[PDB]
């Protein structure tokens, strides 16, 4: 709870996540998988959290949001972690049918990899990223600010980690808006969990990425596609954040 340990934990975790995200770039054929299934760069926040947990004191606070136990609140949060991806995929479908050229499912695209290999890969990508960003980093920031501002801080760091400047700066702006809203939803999805946040965070992260690739795989790189996704995610974000604020 020390002010120094808080700032260094924020600093240490961030710099080693970004450092490993670049150091693991060349190390792409050391797991026996291709990027389509599992991006090795997603192990950067996982290793970052494990190293921070060891180099810092107060292991009780370090492992606060790592509650592996099934609880009735997380079961309730688990099905919320399924609705919110489903509603965003719905808004994306209507936008693609109405304003674009529809969408194609993954199974009808001539895949050289089984669909189970992809689903298992997106779950493990969801597990390692949320283990370090929401199960560890979130409750660390939550020791000095409430869930809202803690979600804003983890949102900025996750968006830098998930930054995508491949398709231009305008595409990266809307992808930034999507990953930022992606973090505000999960900050609320794991609010007041008594730590039991791994299952909530991985269920939402996996359903999101797999739901996007299973439905909008033919839309990769389209500036209009990242716009409606960023907007549909932000619209569902402000509604879910606004809902849980007035009942509060």
């Amino acid at each position: 709870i020390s002010g120094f340990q808080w700032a260094m934990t924020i600093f240490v975790f961030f710099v080693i996540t970004m450092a490993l995200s670049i150091m693991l770039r060349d190390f792409q054929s050391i797991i026996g998988v291709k990027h389509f299934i599992f991006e090795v760069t997603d192990l950067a926040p996982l290793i970052a959290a494990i190293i921070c947990i060891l180099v810092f004191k107060y292991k009780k606070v370090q492992l606060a949001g790592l509650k592996f136990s099934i609880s009735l609140k997380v079961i309730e949060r688990l099905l919320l972690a399924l609705i919110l991806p489903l509603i965003i995929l719905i808004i994306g479908m209507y936008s693609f049918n109405t304003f674009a050229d529809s969408f194609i499912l993954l199974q009808s695209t001539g895949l050289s990899v089984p669909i189970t290999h992809i689903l298992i890969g997106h779950i493990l990508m969801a597990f390692v990223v949320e283990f370090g960003f929401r199960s560890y980093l979130q409750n660390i920031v939550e020791t000095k600010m409430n869930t809202f501002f803690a979600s804003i801080v983890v949102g900025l760091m996750y968006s830098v980690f998930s930054a995508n400047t491949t398709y231009g700066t305008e595409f990266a702006a809307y992808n930034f808006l999507y990953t930022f809203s992606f973090s505000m939803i999960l900050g609320e999805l794991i609010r007041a969990t008594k730590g039991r946040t791994i299952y909530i965070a991985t269920t939402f992260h996996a359903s999101m990425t797999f739901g996007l690739i299973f439905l909008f795989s033919e839309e990769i790189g389209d500036l209009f596609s990242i716009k409606v996704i960023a907007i549909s995610t932000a619209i569902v974000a402000v509604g879910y954040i606004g809902l849980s604020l007035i009942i509060r």
């Binding site: 009735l72 609140k73 079961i75 309730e76 489903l86 995929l89 719905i90 050229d101 194609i104």
Partner: protein
């Protein structure tokens, strides 16, 4: 704290939201059946007398030999099997020899857009294709697949526009493009018809396809274009005897990749089959 009634409320929302999710992916998983409108046209010529008229007076019926490099004359038995319209009825792919290529069916726009996913030039003008197929009375599946094959490797470069002086002309159906020079002859044809915009190339070519190949009602289907059962051996669109079967497979496979089927069919009945038909209809409809 942990709650049990909040779970029931969310299992309920989970079932509802998953229902609308499935209700929007149902188009791309389940077969869409279409009620068929089949026109049955009785003929005065028997199948034997129609086969006789294909065997001798024209005798331009070609067949690719086992080498698949040279054409030869078709046998009398080979012509008989290729023109027996009764064998193609219970066939899944060859039933489209009888598809009325002149009747716009009205297939969902999203189904067509999903087929042109790897052809961005044709996907941009999906609306122009469907508007033309309906205004110019051409089957949209036939109009599209023709534009797909007539805009191949060197021909799609003609679909994006050829710079001629200070104008760029488009040709989406490869019409007027001779085998000597497909881009040059194709662009010169589009320049004489004022196809300076893609929309003009879509409608004008669909207008050309209807006025040049769908003029006579007696030759609407692929079968009647190849064998002309109302005038056997005469105004026939091809010499290859597998021509009607090769195009029908292209049409049938296009329909299968969209998870739907054709609607308007026109089948011609030879004289020998037309005897036991009219008696069976009256028998199966009237019951005293």
């Amino acid at each position: 704290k942990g709650s049990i009634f909040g779970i029931i409320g969310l299992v309920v929302i989970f079932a509802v939201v998953s229902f609308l999710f499935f209700s929007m992916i149902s188009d791309q998983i389940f077969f869409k059946h279409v009620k068929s409108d089949i026109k049955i046209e009785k003929l005065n010529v028997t199948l034997n007398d129609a086969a006789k008229k294909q065997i001798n007076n024209y005798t331009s019926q070609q067949v690719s030999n086992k080498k698949n490099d040279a054409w030869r004359d078709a046998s009398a038995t080979e012509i008989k099997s290729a023109m027996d319209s009764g064998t193609f009825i219970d066939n899944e792919k060859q039933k489209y020899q009888f598809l009325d290529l002149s009747k716009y069916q009205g297939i969902d726009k999203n189904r067509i857009k999903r087929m042109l996913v790897d052809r961005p030039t044709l996907l941009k003008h999906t609306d122009d294709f469907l508007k033309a197929a309906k205004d110019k009375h051409v089957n949209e599946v036939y109009l599209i697949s023709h534009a797909l094959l007539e805009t191949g490797a060197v021909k799609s470069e003609l679909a994006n526009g050829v710079e001629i002086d200070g104008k760029k002309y488009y040709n989406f159906y490869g019409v007027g493009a001779l085998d000597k020079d497909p881009i040059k002859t194709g662009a010169e044809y589009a320049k004489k018809h004022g196809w300076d915009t893609p929309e003009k190339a879509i409608s004008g070519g669909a207008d050309f396809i209807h006025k040049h190949f769908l003029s006579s009602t007696d030759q609407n289907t692929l079968y009647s274009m190849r064998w002309n059962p109302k005038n056997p051996g005469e105004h026939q669109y091809a010499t290859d005897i597998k021509w009607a079967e090769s195009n029908a497979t292209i049409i049938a496979d296009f329909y299968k990749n969209m998870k739907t089927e054709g609607k308007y069919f026109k089948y011609f009945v030879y004289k020998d089959d037309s005897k036991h038909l009219n008696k069976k209809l009256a028998a199966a409809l009237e019951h005293h």
